[PDB]
Design a protein around this nucleic acid. Structure first.
Lengths: 113, 274, 234, 348, 93
RNA sequence: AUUGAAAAAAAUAAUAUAUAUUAUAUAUAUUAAUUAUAAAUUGAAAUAUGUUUAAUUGAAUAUAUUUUAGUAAUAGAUAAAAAUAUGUACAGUAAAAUUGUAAGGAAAACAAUAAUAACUUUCUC
């Protein structure tokens, strides 16, 4: 009927498939449904607020930068030129790592190079 | 059929009739997939995404600061040129195609608080070419992909036909999977930390790699996939293993911006940039 | 007007941000919803039948109550496939060493040492400095030469202050903002830069490494207003 | 805690069921849902875990938001803005959501869903837009009741009709239904549910049922026929069922003549239109209007011309459509209308 | 010639009844090369893993900061730098 | 309905039952199912009845009665790989060329490549 390789392939396929592995549908009572809706809506609102806060902050930073660069242009042309360069190949430093869940054994390195 | 003449009749009102809602056929389908009452419901925002949080906090501001060019105006792309009306044959003529390209190119905007570059989507294209002989290899590749991602893969089929390579048309051959949001972020984090350091002579992603507009890519060999923790934990269960292409799609206007963004997430870049 | 160089050194967080009370609970709920809706664990794949590893897993697990004729099941009749009650959430209990994570709060945090870099791990720390007067501020430096670029000059000044203990990285050549005034006809152009690996430890009397919330307490109100948005909230 | 206060706020914003309210607001998931009436089913049921504390937090968050909105709402002077503020404050209230979703909107009981309350009215409007309004629009366009009678419609009020007096059975007519001559023998009953903010005391309404498809053999075409015409009707958000109780004999500009389609004349559209009166300033009370009853004719009726004359704006519509059956002759006889014509089966 | 698994009749997923594939996933703790632990959701059943070769001990990711084993074992008395200096004359090549 | 936990009711829709009308309506009750379907000397689980250990529950083990395992793809109204070529209903847009990417090369697969003025809703200064 089937080889051992064929069997193993079938098993692998099954791992991915939804055939006889999935539970019943999540039914709720009307009160429960409402509670869920209120949870979700509030959360969504909170997320929107956070986005606006961050977005606003970014806008403020941009405005400050603009204000700075105009001033620099007014005062010292060479300094302005130096500031406003193409940073095409700018690379973030490899020490600035993505913050983990829990910290390492040695928290901070005081010596380098 | 009395005729094939298609011709949509005009209306006498501005109300937008959603025809789906007027039926009683698919009552489960009227609910959005986000809604709890739909069978299509899935808990989306299950836990705090770490890479995304990092981007929000540290990187995004830094990226904005980098990309500020003073009084930078919009750079319009190559577009379809209109004809000068110096002849009456120009009068209903289609426009001249773009200068260099056949297809139109997008406008490059200055980076401000709104349009800072960020990760949009990852796609993991695995086309196993031995599966022209063995269909079961495609299945195994799809499983591997699923294991790696925690996301449902989609089967790739042979779209073309060719004699030199023993390839038919309409044959299942490997799989793909578009990761988005938190799963994608996790996958990137795994790539940065676990897998790519275990590759021996790994210089990084090439600086000559990428789209013209905010898309960067690279690929992993069959040797490299055994470093993924889901595959590594049962090497008996994974005798064969398949390479893959990894298309990273950013919200970057240009490719150097996208490269910079990826560097922020601890991706090394080695080659001479364009 | 005199050109001056402001510098704020940003030590970035080394671990995840702490979740809000609202957030945590919501996330737990979503996890429990996922679990309820999650598929059966396909144990037949990961554990081979008639193997020592499978047996341990089986022992760890406890099975579901099957339907049996002539009995009332007041929580409905058991719906079972691959050995799981479809009507409920499934729980699957699981050098050779237990992975024990380190404490997120630190010794420095406990002591409240403001000069230390390990004192907050989930927040963005900013280098502040106290001058001859009682005021605090971000490191200022006089730019008399004006030959070199501004950010480079700032970095050099920082290095000089340190005695080559610090290891910084400028985010860009562009200045983030300016602090300006009429009494002293000057202009402090603020650069942004990131401490990567070093001490500071040292005209300025004292220094500290603080979050955005603590800087408000230390620094003046007008100054804070001027330079609030530059600092990350977390 | 603004949503627990009912000093200034209406009673309708609360849930009237006590058990349901208790279930909503508890400190642990101990109680069982009032919705599940049966004991065995309650036993079987299991709500999702951790739902209570999070729900409470969400309530607090949205309650705070509502309170903040109210701080603005009371300072506001102009009425539409104030209403909008009120809506914003209370729309995310769980109790009002429960009330609206799970109790009837058509024949709303005032204590549960009060359409005098702005939030509930907004909810009702949204519900109407979701399905019933779209359906009505489709039936107007497909059947060709808009351009044939009255150019366009901008649906504002939800209009539902009924024929209670003829047969006995209770049924709201779905737009574009085929009703028997027995069903539509005696007059219908309207319900004009208004969702916009409008002056309840001043605003009058007119209702016109028009039959565009009565055949005129001189013209070799059709003509309109005003089958039923009411004017100067007073509506209120909750008190809105236009019945012989409400309107007086003075309000009837053309008293109900029934659908009596001729044999082979075809299917006849009867499309009720609901207009609101023009509102005059510097005049307290409801501004009436006089109709020249000799000028307007029933056997031929320019609806558009009539509208132009009295400066009406069509807010709502509904439509049924009748064709010939055996009982139309009986209906004619009852009403004292003539025998009724019979046309050739072929449209030659 | 072409090795395949021949398809059975497909099961009709009705419109609206399609359910999203929520695979069974465990919360897995990865301790990296150093003691930094990170939680990640994973399909394989293992609550804890500790990694040997990661970015946190690779030189590319931090520039600023068993044949060999067998050999070491069975040439241990000799103790095999000084040895390199002794046995590295760079004239002949 | 009995069982668990610590007077009632007021939508839609479905189901059950009843009746109203030359009206596929209304009334009351209740919220099921939702990816399954025969056949397994062998795997796994439960319950019942025994026996031994620390009246007791856990733990171990025997028999009986069941339940699961036949492990197989679409999870989306799918949308230019291949497959039902006539009906109807609903919805969408192709191709080329270009820039890239593990074996991949001119030629296998995947990604990306025209413009947002005005409008509606949401959050926010």
């Amino acid at each position: 009927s089937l080889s051992p390789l064929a069997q193993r392939v079938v098993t692998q396929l099954s791992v991915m498939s939804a055939s006889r592995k999935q539970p019943k549908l999540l039914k709720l009572a009307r009160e429960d449904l409402i509670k869920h809706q209120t949870i979700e809506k509030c959360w969504s609102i909170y997320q929107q607020q956070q986005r606006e806060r961050r977005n606003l902050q970014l806008e403020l930073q941009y405005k400050s930068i603009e204000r700075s660069m105009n001033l620099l242009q007014e005062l010292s042309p060479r300094l302005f030129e130096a500031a406003n360069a193409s940073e095409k190949g700018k690379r973030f430093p490899m020490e600035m790592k993505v913050p983990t869940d829990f910290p390492p054994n040695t928290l901070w390195h005081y010596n380098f190079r | 059929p009395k005729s094939a003449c298609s011709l949509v009749k005009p209306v006498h009102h501005l109300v937008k009739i959603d025809k789906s809602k007027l039926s009683p056929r698919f009552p489960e389908l009227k609910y959005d997939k986000s809604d709890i009452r739909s069978p299509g419901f899935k808990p989306k925002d299950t836990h705090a995404d770490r890479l995304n949080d990092h981007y929000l906090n540290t990187l995004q501001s830094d990226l904005l600061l980098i990309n500020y060019s003073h009084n930078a105006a919009v750079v319009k792309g190559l577009k379809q040129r209109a004809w000068s009306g110096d002849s009456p044959y120009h009068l209903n003529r289609p426009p001249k195609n773009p200068r260099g390209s056949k297809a139109q190119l997008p406008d490059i905007h200055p980076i401000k608080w709104s349009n800072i570059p960020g990760l949009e989507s990852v796609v993991i294209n695995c086309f196993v070419r031995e599966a022209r002989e063995n269909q079961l290899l495609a299945i195994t590749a799809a499983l591997q992909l699923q294991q790696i991602t925690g996301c449902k893969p989609h089967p790739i089929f042979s779209k073309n036909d060719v004699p030199t390579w023993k390839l038919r048309k309409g044959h299942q051959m490997g799989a793909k999977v578009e990761l988005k949001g938190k799963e994608m972020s996790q996958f990137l984090s795994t790539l940065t930390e676990i897998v790519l350091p275990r590759i021996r002579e790994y210089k990084g992603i090439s600086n000559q790699s990428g789209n013209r507009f905010g898309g960067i890519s690279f690929g992993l060999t069959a040797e490299d996939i055994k470093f993924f923790p889901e595959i590594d934990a049962n090497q008996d269960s994974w005798p064969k293993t398949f390479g893959m292409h990894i298309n990273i799609n950013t919200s970057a206007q240009l490719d150097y911006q996208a490269r910079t963004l990826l560097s922020g997430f601890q991706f090394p870049f080695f080659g001479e940039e364009k | 007007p005199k050109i001056k160089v402001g510098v704020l050194l940003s030590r970035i967080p080394i671990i995840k941000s702490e979740l809000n009370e609202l957030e945590k609970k919501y996330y737990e709920y979503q996890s429990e919803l996922e679990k309820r809706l999650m598929w059966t664990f396909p144990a037949y794949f990961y554990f081979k039948k008639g193997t020592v590893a499978e047996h341990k897993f089986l022992s760890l697990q406890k099975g579901p109550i099957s339907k049996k004729n002539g009995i009332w099941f007041p929580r409905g009749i058991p719906d079972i496939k691959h050995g799981r009650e479809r009507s409920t959430k499934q729980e699957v209990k699981l050098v050779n060493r237990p992975v024990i994570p380190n404490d997120r709060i630190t010794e420095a945090d406990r002591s409240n040492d403001m000069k230390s870099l390990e004192r907050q791990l989930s927040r963005t720390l900013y280098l502040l400095v106290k001058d001859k007067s009682g005021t605090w501020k971000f490191p200022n430096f006089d730019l008399s030469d004006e030959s070199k670029p501004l950010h480079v000059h700032a970095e050099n000044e920082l290095k000089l202050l340190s005695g080559d203990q610090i290891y910084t990285w400028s985010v860009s050549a562009t200045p983030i903002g300016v602090l300006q005034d009429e009494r002293n006809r000057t202009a402090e152009f603020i650069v942004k830069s990131h401490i990567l690996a070093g001490k500071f430890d040292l005209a300025f009397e004292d220094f500290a490494w603080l979050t955005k919330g603590e800087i408000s307490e230390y620094v003046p109100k007008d100054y804070f207003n001027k330079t609030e948005f530059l600092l990350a909230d977390n | 805690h603004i949503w627990s206060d009912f000093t200034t706020r209406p009673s309708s914003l609360s849930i009237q069921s006590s058990k349901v309210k208790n279930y909503l607001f508890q400190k642990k998931a101990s109680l069982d849902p009032p919705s599940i009436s049966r004991r065995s089913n309650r036993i079987k049921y299991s709500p999702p875990e951790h739902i209570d504390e999070i729900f409470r937090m969400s309530y607090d968050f949205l309650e705070q938001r509502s309170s903040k909105f109210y701080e603005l709402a009371n300072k506001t002077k102009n009425p539409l803005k104030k209403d909008a503020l009120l809506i914003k404050a209370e729309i995310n209230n769980p109790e009002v959501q429960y009330n609206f979703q799970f109790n009837n909107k058509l024949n709303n009981v005032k204590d549960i869903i009060d359409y005098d309350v702005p939030v509930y009215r907004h909810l009702g409007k949204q519900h109407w837009e979701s399905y019933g309004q779209m359906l009505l629009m489709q039936r107007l366009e497909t059947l060709a009741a808009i351009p044939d009678t009255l150019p366009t419609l901008v649906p504002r009020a939800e209009v539902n009709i009924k024929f209670p007096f003829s047969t006995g059975v209770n049924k709201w007519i779905e737009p574009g239904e085929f009703l028997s001559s027995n069903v539509t023998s005696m007059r219908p009953i309207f319900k004009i549910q208004e969702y916009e903010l409008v002056n309840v005391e001043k605003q009058l309404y007119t209702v016109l049922i028009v039959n565009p498809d009565v055949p005129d053999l001189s013209n070799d075409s059709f003509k309109t026929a005003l089958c039923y015409g009411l004017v100067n009707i007073n509506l209120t958000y909750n008190d809105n069922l236009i019945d012989p109780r409400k309107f007086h004999s003075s309000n009837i500009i053309a008293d109900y003549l029934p659908p009596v389609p001729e044999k082979n004349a075809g299917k006849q559209r009867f499309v009720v239109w609901v207009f609101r009166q023009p509102l005059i300033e510097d005049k307290q009370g409801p501004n009436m209007l006089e109709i020249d009853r000799k000028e307007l004719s029933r056997d031929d009726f320019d609806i558009r011309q009539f509208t132009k004359k009295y400066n009406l704006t069509a807010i709502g519509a509904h439509i049924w459509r009748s064709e010939w059956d055996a009982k139309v002759a009986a209906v004619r006889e009852k009403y004292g209308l003539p025998p009724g014509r019979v046309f050739s089966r072929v449209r030659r | 010639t072409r090795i395949t698994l021949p398809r059975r009749p497909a099961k009709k997923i009705q419109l609206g009844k399609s359910r999203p594939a929520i695979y069974h996933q465990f919360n897995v703790k990865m301790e990296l090369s150093d003691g930094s632990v990170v939680i990640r959701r994973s399909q394989y059943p293992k609550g804890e893993i500790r990694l040997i070769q990661d970015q946190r001990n690779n030189p590319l990711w931090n520039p600023s900061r068993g044949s060999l084993d067998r050999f070491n074992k069975r040439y241990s008395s000799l103790f095999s730098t000084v040895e390199l200096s002794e046995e590295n004359k760079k004239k002949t090549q």
